[PDB]
Amino acid sequence: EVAVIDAIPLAATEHDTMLEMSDMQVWSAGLTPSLVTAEDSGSLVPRGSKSDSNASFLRAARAGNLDKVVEYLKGGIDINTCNQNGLNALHLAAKEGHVGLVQELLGRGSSVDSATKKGNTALHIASLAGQAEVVKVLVKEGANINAQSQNGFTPLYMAAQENHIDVVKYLLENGANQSTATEDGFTPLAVALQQGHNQAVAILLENDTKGKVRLPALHIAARKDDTKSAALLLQNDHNADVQSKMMVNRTTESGFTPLHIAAHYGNVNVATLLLNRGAAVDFTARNGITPLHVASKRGNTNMVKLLLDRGGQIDAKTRDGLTPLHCAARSGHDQVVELLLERGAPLLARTKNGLSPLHMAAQGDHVECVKHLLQHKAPVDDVTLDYLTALHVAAHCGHYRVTKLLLDKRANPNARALNGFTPLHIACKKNRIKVMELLVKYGASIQAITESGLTPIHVAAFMGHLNIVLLLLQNGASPDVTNIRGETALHMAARAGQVEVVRCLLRNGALVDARAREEQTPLHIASRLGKTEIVQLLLQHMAHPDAATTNGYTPLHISAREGQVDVASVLLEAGAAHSLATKKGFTPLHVAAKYGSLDVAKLLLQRRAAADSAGKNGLTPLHVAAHYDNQKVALLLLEKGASPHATAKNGYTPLHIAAKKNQMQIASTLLNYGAETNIVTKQGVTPLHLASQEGHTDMVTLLLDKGANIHMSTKSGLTSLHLAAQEDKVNVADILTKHGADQDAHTKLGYTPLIVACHYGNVKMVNFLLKQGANVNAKTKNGYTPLHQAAQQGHTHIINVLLQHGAKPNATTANGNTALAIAKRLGYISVVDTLKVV
């Protein structure tokens, strides 16, 4: 996979800039007090046999008709009857200010602190509506002055919200607690401050001392620019030496000080007061956001002027290096930018990635910011760490106006970034048509290449940006320029699967059988990736279907390896040769027999492809199939008439191959097709020999079930009981004498399977041998008995068991050599000892 067609850094640098500059945002959630909703008297319709009358009674309460009400009370009407919302007669009377009705209702035994569905007492309803007189009656009758409705609202909160001075002043005098807050954390002070009721704020502040009530109020004052309130709130904040402990520098939950907040909304007036009260100009929140950053991001020109004058660091940088000049520039606040510059903000300050303020302005298509920065002599082609110019960035974003400006300001349209990427390469990758045309007009080289040899047209074709591919061709781009792999735009278009692009290049003269590395054409790549439609397209434009790679693979061979059945079909239907060979001498059928592509194999056999095609090695597809344990494909061939008696150059049949690699199923299938087992190679090898040698227990069983001789000698005189001993095949040999394999059999050098079993130290092997008729006294050609071999190689346990069976130690060779003469010749100390005990 090509990962080289990515300007890898830039998306990920936009994000770093974004999410460390999108996070300078005061969560007004806790600075905007929640406002109470008053209980709407309902239509008061019937909802019981007293249904119509309970409803008629409530309307009488709302209208303040004491007379009609008393008659209902005497008439059997329950005084606690209410509407859908839980509003009773005392609530309705309370809202309208019908004082006399209220005393009367309380007199008739109406529950005072009876609450509605929303938790409103008569006192809540009365306070919000400003019925000071109803309240005096309610307070005096012992109503709960600190009762809370559903969201935590208290009567003092409501009175402050609706600027009912007299109610507030009264509620406070009777010990109402203004510290008691809502669920979202708002106090009567906070809401009075939010509503701009300075008169109410003044009163509330006179009663309570706590900064616990005060701090959230101050933040709100900061947002609302309430200088008058801010001054009052800070009446007790004494100038201390530890700034973070002064109330004016205490933060919200977002780490923002009051000054950050004033900076955000551009509240010069409140900020000035805050600062005069010892506000810290460079207190930081989150990832190093100073107030100066915030005002800068916000374009609050006058705030910036103020913070700088108060000793605010013009060059403070965030965690990734944003200076205030970066921020104003990113946001397109040209007036703030020129100001920061004029106050001497560092013009070429860099972020972690090396972007200057000019790069930020280029991102946001901010013309005026770019003009001011260039005006103050910012290098038009100033580069980042990845060697991107402002022009590279504007092209990636597809920003026309800034691109046009930068080019007019003599930016190099061929400036090469880190990987040779030009602005034109990037514009073509991000499919930026208007920018792309603009760059060409200002002189970008149409056929410049990257460090990996990619041209603009390689890139646009690979990305499928069709309109771009066209424009490049219309501007003279050659579709035959090669990258470092030697691939053209067609190769890259085929690799990506961009069908309409492949067509376009082809209708525009692309060399169809253009050779890349390994001499592979686009037809080869399409076949490998199973791009069926593209295989048809190339073939339609005179692609030679028998074109081979360096190692000799045709697109058909490739179909066989990848199991592309559909691809294989289009090729054969185009006149693809079905029996061409690779450098290793494999036909497409062989390849299918190696990778187990059964559907491809079937399609080939139906096309007059030889089931028994050979190579330089003389191997058929069946041989191959047998080796790689491809059971179905192996079965397919036999049915399509592949000889199981087919031999290679070495002499191996398919049965031979299956025997060695323990291919049970494939071995079974061959035998069912009449595969002879008693057939030898050049050096006298049967599949029975190969099966035994590798120690394939069940395999030797199957070979003898279907007629194999257990006694066939090689050209050196070795049977399969010989080989089962040479490779310590204990299980194999134990089945072989169960079917009668003579041990007495000698080779051409006259050594029996009892000579071999003793030469490699096989204890249990020599035991079972003497158990079916083998003799310890049996000599070889040189004269060696089992005790002559067991005394030569220092086998201690084999001499012991040989002397327990009757191996005479007084036997010589033809030149006169006993077991004791070899054991003394090599210095074996416990071996000369046991030959003189027996």
Residue numbers in the entry: 1584 to 1630, 2026 to 2816
From the paper:
Using isothermal titration calorimetry (ITC)-based quantitative binding assays, we identified a 48-residue auto-inhibitory segment (residues 1577–1624, referred to as ‘AS’) as the complete ANK repeat-binding region. After extensive trials of screening and optimization, we succeeded in obtaining good-diffraction crystals of AnkR_AS fused at its C-terminus with the AnkB_repeats and solved the structure of the fusion protein at 3.5 Å resolution. The residues connecting AS and ANK repeats (10 residues in total, ‘GSLVPRGSGS’) are flexible, indicating that the fusion of the two chains together does not introduce obvious conformational restraints to the complex. The 24 ANK repeats form a left-handed helical solenoid with each repeat rotating anti-clockwise by ∼16°. The inner αA helices and the finger loops of the 24 repeats line together to form an elongated concave inner groove, and the αB helices of the repeats form the solvent-exposed convex outer surface. The ANK repeats superhelix has outer and inner diameters of approximately 60 Å and 45 Å, respectively, and a total height of ∼150 Å. In the complex, AS adopts a highly extended structure binding to part of the inner groove formed by the N-terminal 14 ANK repeats (R1–14) with its chain orientation anti-parallel to that of ANK repeats. A 10-residue segment of AS (residues 1592–1601) forms an α helix when bound to ANK repeats. The binding of AS to ANK repeats can be divided somewhat arbitrarily into three sites (sites 1, 2, and 3) formed by the repeats 2–6, 7–10, and 11–14, respectively. The interactions in site 2 are mediated both by hydrophobic and hydrogen bonding interactions, while interactions in site 3 are mainly hydrophobic.
Ankyrins are a family of scaffold proteins which play essential roles in connecting numerous ion channels, cell adhesion molecules, and receptors to the spectrin-based cytoskeleton beneath membranes and thereby provide mechanical support for plasma membranes and control the activities of excitable tissues including neurons and muscles. There are three members in the human ankyrin family: ankyrin-R/B/G (AnkR/B/G) encoded by ANK1/2/3, respectively. They all consist of a highly similar N-terminal membrane binding domain composed of 24 ankyrin (ANK) repeats, a spectrin-binding domain comprised of two ZU5 domains, and a UPA domain followed by a death domain (DD) and a variable C-terminal regulatory domain. The wide-ranging physiological functions of ankyrins are the result of ankyrin's remarkable capacity for binding to and anchoring numerous membrane targets, via their N-terminal 24 ANK repeats, to specific membrane micro-domains in coordination with spectrin-based cytoskeletal structures. The 24 ANK repeats of ankyrins form a superhelical solenoid with an extremely conserved elongated inner groove, which contains multiple quasi-independent target binding sites.
